[PDB]
Design a binder for this molecule. Structure first.
Ligand SMILES: CCCCCCCCCCCCCCCCCC(=O)OC[C@H](COP(=O)([O-])OCC(O)COP(=O)([O-])OC[C@@H](COC(=O)CCCCCCCCCCCCCCCCC)OC(=O)CCCCCCCCCCCCCCCCC)OC(=O)CCCCCCCCCCCCCCCCC
Ligand SMILES: CCCCCCCCCCCCCCCCCC(=O)OC[C@H](COP(=O)([O-])OCC(O)COP(=O)([O-])OC[C@@H](COC(=O)CCCCCCCCCCCCCCCCC)OC(=O)CCCCCCCCCCCCCCCCC)OC(=O)CCCCCCCCCCCCCCCCC
Ligand SMILES: CCCCCCCCCCCCCCCCCC(=O)OC[C@H](COP(=O)([O-])OCC(O)COP(=O)([O-])OC[C@@H](COC(=O)CCCCCCCCCCCCCCCCC)OC(=O)CCCCCCCCCCCCCCCCC)OC(=O)CCCCCCCCCCCCCCCCC
Ligand SMILES: CCCCCCCCCCCCCCCCCC(=O)OC[C@H](COP(=O)(O)OCCN)OC(=O)CCCCCCCCCCCCC
Ligand SMILES: CCCCCCCCCCCCCC(=O)OC[C@H](COP(=O)([O-])OCC[N+](C)(C)C)OC(=O)CCCCCCCCCCCCC
Ligand code: HEM
Ligand code: HEM
Ligand SMILES: CO/C=C(/C(=O)OC)c1ccccc1Oc1cc(Oc2ccccc2C#N)ncn1
Ligand SMILES: CCCCCC(=O)OC[C@H](COP(=O)([O-])OCCN)OC(=O)CCCCC
Ligand SMILES: CCCCCC(=O)OC[C@H](COP(=O)([O-])OCCN)OC(=O)CCCCC
Ligand SMILES: CCCCCC(=O)OC[C@H](COP(=O)([O-])OCCN)OC(=O)CCCCC
Lengths: 52, 105, 378, 48, 89, 61, 52
């Protein structure tokens, strides 16, 4: 449990933070696009084709 | 020996060129279906004939992938088709026939 | 070492779809293996989504299907996918079988005979599916076929009345066909896994019929992308039928509810059964028609026993190639005759084509392989 | 008899357009991977 | 870095290694790079330099492969080429 | 001349697989609207005056 | 096909004829019992409980 507490294991977290942050954007944008989530999509310029 | 046996040989050369495995560089014994007798005969081939058989099959499979053939100059001529496997396959069959004749007694 | 190879689950997927050594020269006729797998899955998904709205009772079986195409959201696209997916299933099955005859793949006895069982159970599946909408052809197609079983001697009527659940195609017959049409596609999928179990024991054949162990390539990426491309063409063919001609292969009579009293003028099966319907009507005798009708498909199990050629594939056998396409054209003749009334001259043509079918498979094609052996001097 | 008539043709048009794009691109992906094999060259050098 | 420092000093031990380092360097570098300069360039390397420098030459690059012997199990070039990147990254 | 567009597309978007995916999911969002908008414009143009949205204004009140 | 034509193969058929004849009786009696075949069962003494 406490094997992963040290300098090297914090360096590994540093190296994968830019990647893990991008997969979260891929998942987030993929969730908004797949469900047509209007809360987020209404703020995008070209996808305002709703005509409420 | 006569003009009629040249017509039987004439249609055999026709069927040979119609079979078209000579277009891929193969020989007749390269195309044989591998049963147990054939597998043993191939196993008994000397090193040089085995390695030659392997490359011709490999080259023909490469052509079959591309749907291509060799130039006509490199086709297998009917007169030059060497039955390199028939003497080995005849002997394998002869041995099996002997085992099958002992099993009857 | 490698997780993909050592994990108990991934090693089966790895040794089947990824690292499988496959021949470098298998052509488009080898794509129909995966396409059949896709059609089976495609028929199960659409089949399930239709079962969420279909009811297996005569008073509402016809109208529940109508309820799907009109009221259910995208019900019409799901139905015609199911009806045309069945036809695409049989296109692929016939290419898949014809590939095996031409190229000699039937020498894999266990793989081939399990294929014959797969052909029979898929035919039985589609036959029962066509009854479920309960149209005119649904009823009368079921009547003329099930009545053939009464020709079996000494147990005919007892067997027919047991399959019916009564004295004719009726309420009890419609409900059980739905249950059997539901259970069978999963039994099919399990047999398709055993179909692959025996195949991977040997690997694939190739167009030349010569062993390809000297030249193998991994199934991934070469045949993963080739099956994906082939699957994309399958969706093109399906969607062209669904979105531009969904009623081309179907019969208009099935848009009329069932009627045990009024018979339609021309009772014709779907296109993928016309060849066997012709063989049935060309035999005058009733019991003889059933045996010939059953022998029309069970004959495939005899092809390995009737192989005379020293060569495996027909690629290097011109005299057998001509007889092979004589079998296709003769089957295209039985298909044509099957969708026509039993009148002159179609009666005589259907009898000639029926004899030519069994004569080509039992006599002529085996004889050609022997002639071809003599011309090569072995 | 076919209330879905107009909508399937609208779908049919989109299917043709997507297929006209996706078929040559997927074909190109197939040829891309296979080019390793389609241009491979063989040579046989047995000892003599 | 420590393996390299030991390798560099262990190699320049003897008149013939040093004579080679002199001759070859004057043709390639046009000068003799002192050992103190190699230590400066080695000490500059850290984990960031290795990640950037290795990615510049390895990541998603076409390798040249040469095989000889019983190499039936040698992976196909496309599979080798796919091993030059990670889908997780 | 600076490097081609495909070269700057690779190093900037396609090198990392994570940005390669972010490019696709973002390209899928704008492609859907642009393709559905354009494709519907072709269907309605070919069927001018026949669809309900064309004869809609006649029965307003 | 003609491998099995000789003295030994006829001796093997002789040795398994009593067995193959008994499995046929097991199959025959098993078929009559499983289906309640009245054509054969009506002749057995104790299973005449039919009362036609
Ligand atoms: C759509 C309906 C398709 C009907 C069947 C078409 C037969 C065919 O050749 O398919 C192409 C395709 C070629 O694949 P392949 O692996 O390169 O060769 C397969 C055989 O080895 C082929 O054996 P082969 O090597 O002897 O070649 C026969 C020849 C056959 O070619 C022809 O007879 C037509 C020639 C067209 C000339 C242009 C006239 C316009 O095919 C070709 O050489 C390539 C044809 C390329 C299409 C060009 C059409 C224009 O084969 C298939 O897809 C078979 C399944 C198709 C059924 C689809 C029905 C759903
Ligand atoms: C039910 C669905 C059944 C699914 C069947 C599965 C087919 C499959 O997965 O095999 C792919 C298999 C791949 O063929 P391949 O990669 O070209 O290799 C063929 C050999 O290397 C042979 O190389 P090659 O030198 O003989 O190449 C001849 C050339 C065909 O020769 C031509 O270029 C004919 C062009 C006609 C237009 C004339 C304008 C002048 O390429 C082809 O044979 C492909 C025929 C398709 C042509 C598409 C339209 C162009 O065959 C195909 O059917 C490809 C069709 C792809 C559709 C492209 C539409 C965009
Ligand atoms: C649909 C279900 C989707 C499941 C996704 C599973 C992804 C996953 O397991 O991550 C591992 C995978 C590890 O690949 P890697 O980083 O290149 O490292 C290679 C390994 O050392 C090991 O490398 P390797 O050399 O042992 O094998 C390379 C492997 C690389 O591909 C994979 O391992 C992915 C697992 C197969 C997914 C199949 C899609 C369905 O390629 C394959 O063997 C897959 C061939 C697919 C055959 C499909 C036949 C049809 O990482 C990802 O793909 C994550 C990104 C996925 C995008 C998700 C969208 C958000
Ligand atoms: C039982 C069900 C009955 C239902 C009836 C259905 C109606 C049938 C409609 C006919 C459609 C015909 C399909 C197109 C045929 C194209 C053939 C071809 O392109 O040329 C011959 C080809 C030669 O290729 P080789 O491999 O010999 O050598 C290649 C070297 N470049 O050789 C080959 O590629 C041939 C491979 C086998 C193709 C199978 C097609 C036949 C389907 C029905 C068979 C049913 C058997 C019981
Ligand atoms: C709940 C909500 C969730 C929503 C989530 C939405 C996400 C959408 C997709 C985004 C993921 C992309 C992953 C990726 O991009 O990695 C897949 C792989 C990479 O591609 P690559 O090899 O160039 O390496 C890449 C090398 N680089 C990175 C250095 C350039 O992509 C390929 O290879 C495969 C592409 C082929 C497509 C066809 C597959 C479908 C199956 C068949 C369809 C037809 C019949 C059914
Ligand atoms: C649900 C039905 C079936 C499915 C899903 C199926 C699937 C497959 C698949 C995926 C393959 C390997 C890839 C390929 O060869 O294309 C294959 C091979 C094969 N199948 Fe089927 N199959 C089915 C039915 C049949 C039938 C009806 C037959 C013949 C009567 C048959 C005979 C064969 C043979 C002989 C092979 C080996 C072909 C070769 O190696 O060249 N299968 N099948
Ligand atoms: C090999 C797989 C299958 C084949 C070949 C097949 C074939 C067919 C065919 C041809 C029809 C006639 C459709 C029509 O004329 O409208 C049908 C009907 C039907 N099938 Fe299937 N089917 C398969 C799998 C399934 C499965 C797994 C289910 C259930 C989960 C299912 C549920 C239905 C239903 C509810 C109907 C009646 C609705 C209708 O007629 O459209 N099918 N089937
Ligand atoms: C319930 O009837 C279904 C039919 C159909 O075509 O379903 C797809 C059908 C319609 C009209 C007339 C007959 C029909 O059924 C059939 C069924 C059929 O089944 C076989 C197919 C191949 C080989 C043997 C048989 C049998 N028996 N062969 C011919 N017609
Ligand atoms: C896991 C199953 C999720 C099912 C969600 C669903 O079917 O879609 C509902 C909404 C529709 O978008 P909206 O802008 O109308 O929003 C209307 C809000 N009710 O989409 C969402 O908002 C997606 C939310 C994802 C959370 C896990
Ligand atoms: C939901 C998205 C899932 C993504 C999985 C994926 O794409 O699989 C990997 C391959 C390409 O990567 P590679 O084989 O070069 O491996 C790279 C190793 N570094 O892609 C394909 O060609 C496989 C076909 C999948 C069909 C379902
Ligand atoms: C393979 C499925 C066979 C189905 C037979 C069936 O369901 O049972 C019918 C008869 C009943 O016995 P019976 O004396 O009334 O006889 C009345 C005769 N109709 O039992 C028999 O006679 C058995 C015949 C077995 C032949 C294969």
């Amino acid at each position: 449990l406490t094997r992963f507490l040290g300098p090297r294991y914090r360096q590994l977290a540093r190296n994968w933070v830019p990647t893990a942050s991008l997969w979260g954007a891929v998942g987030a944008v993929g969730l908004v696009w797949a469900t047509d989530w209007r809360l987020i999509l209404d703020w995008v310029p070209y996808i305002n084709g709703k005509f409420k | 020996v006569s003009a009629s046996s040249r017509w039987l040989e004439g249609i055999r050369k026709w069927y040979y060129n119609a079979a078209g495995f000579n277009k891929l560089g193969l020989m007749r014994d390269d195309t044989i279906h591998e049963n147990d007798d054939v597998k043993e005969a191939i196993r008994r081939l000397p090193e040089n004939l085995y390695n030659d058989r392997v490359f011709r099959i490999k080259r023909a499979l490469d052509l079959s992938m591309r749907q291509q053939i060799l130039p006509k100059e490199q086709w297998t001529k009917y007169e030059e088709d060497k039955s390199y496997l028939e003497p080995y396959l005849k002997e394998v069959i002869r041995e099996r026939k002997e085992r099958e004749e002992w099993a009857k007694k | 070492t490698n997780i993909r190879k050592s994990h108990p689950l991934m090693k089966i997927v790895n040794n089947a779809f990824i690292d499988l050594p496959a021949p470098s020269n298998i052509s488009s006729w080898w794509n129909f293996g995966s396409l059949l797998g896709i059609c089976l899955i495609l028929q199960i998904l659409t089949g399930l989504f239709l079962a969420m709205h279909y009811t297996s009772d005569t008073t509402t079986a016809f109208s529940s299907v109508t309820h799907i195409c009109r009221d259910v959201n995208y019900g019409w696209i799901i139905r015609y996918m199911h009806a045309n997916g069945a036809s695409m299933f049989f296109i692929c099955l016939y290419m898949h079988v014809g590939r095996g005859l031409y190229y000699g793949s039937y020498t894999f006895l266990e793989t081939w005979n399990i294929g014959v069982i797969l052909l029979l159970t898929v035919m039985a599946t589609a036959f029962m599916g066509y009854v479920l909408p309960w149209g005119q052809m649904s009823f009368w197609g079921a009547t003329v076929i099930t009545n053939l079983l009464s020709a079996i001697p000494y147990i005919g009527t007892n067997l027919v009345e047991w399959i019916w659940g009564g004295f004719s195609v009726d309420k009890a017959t419609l409900t059980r066909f739905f249950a059997f049409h539901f259970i069978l596609p999963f039994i099919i999928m399990a047999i398709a896994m055993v179909h692959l179990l025996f195949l991977h024991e040997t690997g694939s054949n190739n167009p030349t019929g010569i062993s390809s162990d000297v030249d193998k390539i991994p199934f991934h990426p070469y045949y993963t992308i080739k099956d994906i491309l082939g699957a994309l063409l399958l969706i093109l063919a399906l969607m062209l039928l669904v979105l531009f001609a969904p009623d081309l292969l179907g019969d208009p009579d099935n848009y009329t509810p069932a009627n045990p009293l009024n018979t339609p003028p021309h009772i014709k099966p779907e296109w993928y059964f016309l060849f066997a319907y012709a063989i049935l009507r060309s035999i005058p005798n009733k019991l003889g028609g059933v045996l010939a009708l059953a022998f029309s498909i069970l004959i495939l199990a005899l092809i390995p026993l009737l192989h005379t050629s020293k060569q495996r594939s027909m690629m290097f056998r011109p005299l057998s190639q001509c007889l092979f396409w004589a079998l296709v054209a003769d089957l295209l003749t039985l298909t044509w005759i099957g969708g026509q009334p039993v009148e002159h001259p179609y009666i005589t043509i259907g009898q000639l084509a029926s004899v030519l079918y069994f004569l080509l498979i039992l006599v002529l094609m085996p004889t050609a392989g022997t002639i071809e052996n003599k011309l090569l001097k072995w | 008899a076919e209330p879905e008539h107009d909508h399937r043709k609208r779908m049919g048009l989109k299917m043709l357009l997507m297929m006209g794009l996706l078929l040559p691109l997927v074909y190109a992906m197939k040829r891309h991977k296979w080019s390793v094999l389609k241009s491979r060259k063989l040579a046989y050098r047995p000892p003599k | 870095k420590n393996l390299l420092r030991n390798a560099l000093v262990s190699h320049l031990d003897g008149t013939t290694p040093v004579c080679e380092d002199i001759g070859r360097s004057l043709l390639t570098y046009g000068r003799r790079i002192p050992l103190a300069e190699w230590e400066s360039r080695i000490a500059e390397v850290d984990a960031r330099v290795v990640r950037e420098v290795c990615s510049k030459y390895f990541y998603d690059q076409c390798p040249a492969v040469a095989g000889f012997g019983p190499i039936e199990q040698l992976p196909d070039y496309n599979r080798i080429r796919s091993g030059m990147f990670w889908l997780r990254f | 001349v600076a490097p081609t567009l495909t070269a700057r597309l690779y190093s900037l978007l396609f090198r990392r697989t994570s940005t390669f995916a972010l490019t696709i999911v973002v390209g899928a969002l704008f492609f859907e609207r642009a393709f559905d908008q354009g494709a519907d414009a072709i269907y309605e143009h070919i069927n001018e005056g026949k669809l309900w949205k064309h004869i809609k204004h006649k029965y307003e009140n």
